[PDB]
Amino acid sequence: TPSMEDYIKQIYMLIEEKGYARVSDIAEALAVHPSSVTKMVQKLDKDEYLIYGLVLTSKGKKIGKRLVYRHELLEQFLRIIGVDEEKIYNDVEGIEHHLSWNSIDRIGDLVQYFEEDDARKKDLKSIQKK
Amino acid sequence: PSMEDYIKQIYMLIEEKGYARVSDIAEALAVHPSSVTKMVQKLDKDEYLIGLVLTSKGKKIGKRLVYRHELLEQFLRIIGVDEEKIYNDVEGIEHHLSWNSIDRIGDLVQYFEEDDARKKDLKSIQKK
């Protein structure tokens, strides 16, 4: 579920940054009540994404890494096509949960398409002026 | 999001049939008629509509939502998404893109439509 994804991603990021993931830190990151975190952590434990501080299983590690990649890729996509930086995080936080892997792969190809030659970015800019 | 899907469907039904029955909305969204009635009251109260007729505010929004939906399908289509995946993705992402992102996506679509070479170059990337 979208929510589950947000928690897995935040948990992965906390562990990578701090070394560990406190319920309290997840609550702050997501702007939710700790009860909401505790409930989700239970579903995550049950579904074998983590154990119990919280330690991701190999499945939870793989999934979290892909979720962070997806986020970064999506920000990079919106940045390249020239969306105002302030708007990017909010849009990615929403759209990330509704793109198939197929779309994400194709978006990956599109980002590499532009990154591989700045001249295509300049042409995109030229279109934006028109 | 919820309201957006309702206004979009209501608009399309009116353009398509000439009117929007609660039962047709219920079927289009896979919700129960009791939910449609509740929503319709909100849209009446929020002044998107007035059987039921969209106000100028409702018709302008419905048209924009339709444009955004079609634009997003055309975008995913252009960048090579399997046709069968496209609708479900558009129905989800459409609600969480700012106008800024939609306009840039539109520029991006025009970018590819201007030169078939650019599409050829993207297909080459995909193979690589």
Q: Extract the tokens encoding A51.
A: 């154990």
In this structure, how many other beta carbons lie within 10 angstroms of the beta carbon of residue B67? Answer: 12
3-state helix, strand, coil in chain B (%, to 5): 80, 0, 20
Could you tell me which chain A residue has the CA closest to the CA of B73? Answer: A103
Helix (H) or strand (E) segment spanning residue A50: strand A50-51
Method: X-ray
- For residue B101, give the nearest of A91, A93, A127 by CB distance: A91
Q: Strand pairing partners for B35? A: none
Where exactly are the structural domains of chain A?
Answer: 1-67, 68-130
Q: Strand pairing partners for A65? A: none
Q: Which long-range contacts (CB under 8 A, 24 or more apart) does B46-55 make?
A: B46/B3, B48/B3, B48/B7, B49/B10, B51/B19, B51/B20, B51/B21, B52/B10, B52/B19, B52/B20, B54/B7, B54/B10, B54/B11, B54/B14
With 0-12 / 13-18 / 19 or more C-beta atoms within 10 angstroms meaning exposed / middle / buried, residue A130 is: exposed
Q: B52 vs chain A: nearest CA distance in angstroms?
A: 31
- B16 contacts: CB under 8 Å, gap ≥ 6: none
CATH label, A68-130, candidates 1.10.60.10, 1.20.810.10, 2.40.440.10, 1.20.1440.230: 1.10.60.10
Phi, psi of A83 (to 5 degrees): -65, 135
Resolution of the experimental structure, in angstroms: 1.9
Task: Please tell me the CATH code under which domain A1-67 is placed.
Answer: 1.10.10.10
Is residue B110 within 8 A of residue A127, CB to CB? The reply is yes
CB contact under 8 A, A109 and B80: yes
Architecture of domain B1-65: Orthogonal Bundle (1.10)
